[PDB]
Every structure is written in structure tokens, then in C-alpha cells.
Design a binder for this molecule. Structure first.
Ligand SMILES: NC(=O)c1ccc[n+]([C@@H]2O[C@H](COP(=O)([O-])OP(=O)(O)OC[C@H]3O[C@@H](n4cnc5c(N)ncnc54)[C@H](OP(=O)(O)O)[C@@H]3O)[C@@H](O)[C@H]2O)c1
Ligand SMILES: N=C(N)NC(=N)NCCc1ccccc1
Ligand code: NA
Length: 159
């Protein structure tokens, strides 16, 4: 199955720069636990944002242009990206907006973090209708000494 995992601030704004509001320790821990030892598909700009391969995961980068880092696996289409994952239980799509838009219709699961912070951004998680998805896990969390904003985790399964 294909899953999307994303962290959404207000208005569905997304980002993966190492700065607030995208570096909440609780969300980094959630991302690690739900992606470890699974292939991760990302777009070229998300690859540039992360700045290095994610350890313990097969890293698959979407780009229309030849790859620029042989440590990871580069593909030129959605179908190629999926094929590069092989026969595995779960493929994790980790961004960004353009990539989420294409894989959302192919996804069986959504792993969403909602962050109670306003941030300016040009990129958003795609709109989806809660109607087509069943919430199978949900937990709200307050801000604390490690996490400067409140946030919530949910896992949604396609009905
Ligand atoms: N300055 C600009 O013109 C510009 C444009 C877009 C994004 N950005 C920056 O990137 C941020 C995030 O954009 P984003 O989240 O949409 O990026 P993203 O999804 O992480 O990466 C998108 C890139 O992935 C590749 N890609 C996506 N779908 C593909 C497909 N079907 N086949 C082949 N390659 C595919 C393309 O790379 P290639 O470009 O290598 O083909 C595309 O430009 C923006 O907020 C902005 O900071 C800048
Ligand atoms: N943005 C996501 N794909 N999911 C998510 N919940 N948080 C991302 C956390 C993150 C991991 C690695 C590098 C930078 C940021
Ligand atoms: Na799991």
C-alpha cells in the first residue's frame, strides 16, 4: 500500500526546513516511527530541503532531470517511483506538495500531523474530504517544554 505522511500548519501549509514550526520533536519522533525501514518517496525540492539521505530507509527522489547524488535512487515518473520500491508492505510518500497531489489518489493511508501555528508558505497539502477516510488513530497533544506549539496526530484509512 501507498501512504502519505505530512505535517500541516494552519491552512494546510507544509514544509521540511529545520526550523519552526517544522521541527517539533514530537513530530520528528512520529515521522521516524512511521517511516523507519520503509521506502520513502520525495520530490526533488524536498530532497534539497532535507539536505541528506534519511537513514534506514530506501530514499527515492522524483526529478525530471538526472540525479545528482548516487546515495539515493532517482526516478522520472510516479510509476517509476512506485516500481523502485519493489514488493514491500508500505511505501511512504513524504512530500512535497506536488508529489502529495499526485499520490493522494493512490494512497490507502494518511498520517497527518496538525500543528497549531501560523506560517507563511507557498505550498500546501492537498484538500481531501474527511468523508472518504476513516479515522483509525487520533491524539491531541498540548505544548510542553519540548514542543512549543500544540499539535495532533491522526491516521486516516481510505474507505
Ligand atoms: N523557485 C521555483 O520555481 C520553485 C518551483 C517549485 C518549488 N519550489 C520550492 O519548492 C518548495 C516545495 O515545492 P513542492 O513541495 O511542490 O516540491 P516537491 O514536491 O518536494 O518537489 C517537486 C519536484 O519533484 C519532481 N517531480 C514531481 N513530480 C514528478 C513527476 N511526476 N515526475 C518527475 N519529477 C517529478 C520535480 O523535480 P524537477 O524540478 O527536478 O523536475 C518537481 O519540481 C516551494 O515551497 C519552493 O520553496 C520552487
Ligand atoms: N513532513 C512530513 N513528511 N512528515 C512529517 N510529519 N514531519 C516531517 C519531519 C521531518 C523529518 C525529516 C526531515 C525534516 C522534517
Ligand atoms: Na504501522
Amino acid at each position: 500500500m501507498i501512504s502519505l505522511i505530512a505535517a500541516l500548519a494552519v491552512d494546510r501549509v507544509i514544509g521540511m526546513e529545520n526550523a519552526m514550526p517544522w521541527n517539533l520533536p514530537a513530530d520528528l519522533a512520529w515521522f521516524k516511527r512511521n517511516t523507519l525501514n520503509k521506502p520513502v518517496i520525495m520530490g526533488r525540492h524536498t530532497w534539497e530541503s532535507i539536505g541528506r539521505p534519511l537513514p534506514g530507509r530506501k530514499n527515492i527522489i522524483l526529478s525530471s532531470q538526472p540525479g545528482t547524488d548516487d546515495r539515493v535512487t532517482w526516478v522520472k515518473s510516479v510509476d517509476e517511483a512506485i516500481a523502485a520500491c519493489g514488493d514491500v508492505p508500505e511505501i511512504m510518500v513524504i512530500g512535497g506538495g506536488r508529489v502529495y497531489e499526485q499520490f493522494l489518489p493512490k494512497a490507502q493511508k494518511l498520517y497527518l500531523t496538525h500543528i497549531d501555528a501560523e506560517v507563511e508558505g507557498d505550498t500546501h497539502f492537498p484538500d481531501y474530504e474527511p468523508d472518504d477516510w476513516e479515522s483509525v488513530f487520533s491524539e491531541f497533544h498540548d505544548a510542553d517544554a519540548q514542543n512549543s506549539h500544540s499539535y495532533c496526530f491522526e491516521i486516516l484509512e481510505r474507505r
